[PDB]
Amino acid sequence: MQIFVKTLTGKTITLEVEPSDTIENVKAKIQDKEGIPPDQQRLIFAGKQLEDGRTLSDYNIQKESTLHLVLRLRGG
């Protein structure tokens, strides 16, 4: 699905991929396109963070509808 990804800088990004894809797979399309090692980035979703491995579908989301995610910076 077209998962939305908004950054604190407003930089929006759209990734079209089957929710069964892994999480580290997504962070990949980002890390390369932004060149920001996930180390200095932490994702926030509904008050919970995403763990490595496992997929979005495999996690069994409740709404399974439009998934909204927002990337955050490390430190400040």
From TrEMBL:
Record-annotated Ubiquitin-like domain positions: 1-76
UniProt protein name: Ubiquitin B
Cellular compartments annotated: Cytoplasm; Mitochondrion outer membrane; Nucleus
Organism: Homo sapiens
UniProt record similarity statement: Belongs to the ubiquitin family.
UniProt entry tagged with the keyword Membrane: yes
GO cellular component, one term: mitochondrial outer membrane
Domain of life of the source: Eukaryota
UniProt entry keywords in alphabetical sequence: ADP-ribosylation, Cytoplasm, Isopeptide bond, Membrane, Mitochondrion, Mitochondrion outer membrane, Nucleus, Ubl conjugation
Topology relative to the membrane: Peripheral membrane protein
